[PDB]
Swiss-Prot record:
Description of how the protein assembles with itself and partners: Homodimer. Homodimerization is essential for its catalytic activity. Can form heterodimers with isoform 5 of ADAR/ADAR1.
Biased composition (Low complexity): 119-140
Annotated localization: Nucleus; Nucleus, Nucleolus
Record protein name field: Double-stranded RNA-specific editase 1
Region (Disordered): 103-147
Function comment: Catalyzes the hydrolytic deamination of adenosine to inosine in double-stranded RNA (dsRNA) referred to as A-to-I RNA editing.
Gene that this sequence comes from: Adarb1
Free-text tissue specificity from the UniProt record: Brain and peripheral tissues.
Organism of derivation: Rattus norvegicus (Rat)
Amino acid sequence: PGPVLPKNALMQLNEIKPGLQYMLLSQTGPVHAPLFVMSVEVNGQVFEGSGPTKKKAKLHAAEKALRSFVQFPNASEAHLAMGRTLSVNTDFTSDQADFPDTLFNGFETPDKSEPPFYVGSNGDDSFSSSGDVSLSASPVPASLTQPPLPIPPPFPPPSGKNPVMILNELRPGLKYDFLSESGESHAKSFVMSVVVDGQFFEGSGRNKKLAKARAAQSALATVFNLHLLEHHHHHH
RNA sequence: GGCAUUAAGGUGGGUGGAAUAGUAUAACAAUAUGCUAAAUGUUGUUAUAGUAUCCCACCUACCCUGAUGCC
């Protein structure tokens, strides 16, 4: 239907509030996933809530203490004739609200190019199947819109710019890999590859920096629908 | 065969610099709940800071290749 807001628990607490008290426990963790546990006290009942940042913590705390407090807005008696326990009858289930979507078929080109389409006496294994794999990605199919190579066509490397950061600051939502060399310590030719939005790029060089500058340059221009050698003053 | 000097490239480590990210602290205003009043909440603007992510430069060590000289 739509989103929700804490203003409910906030207003409601503000109403019931006879003069309550908020506490802040924990508050420790990494620099980007800190945990705060705020505990809220009314009439001697305290309820603790664990959220990132103080907002959600105090919120959940307020909710709990609200629901408890509405049953003890005042007191004059107590007992011990009650308690609580645990269970394990929930380690399994019999219902859901979602479904799988994984692959179930796949194929590979039977030859260096597409097979005939006007004959029936030049083979015996290209008209009696439609797939042979569903658990791998080793095939090398095509789309008649780009060469069948595992890589896009060649591109010119940079000569003073550095596309690794531009890309890693316009769309850092990628991953990179590094690939083999071709010498002992001289005439070396290392390479890097990348995967970006699902596409794949690669680039070689005399060192790891130059190789990433070519693989990145390729990834940037293609995925950003832009280029790197057609301007030089877009900013200053 | 060993030794000296000179030069090119690559790799590891250390140091320094920059950008991005989330959180936190502090100030100001507005908006909301009550408006008897108090208090609190929500949002906006501004300033500051440990860290994490990533890059760049410098320094050092190592590896390797070229050139020349001596024995």
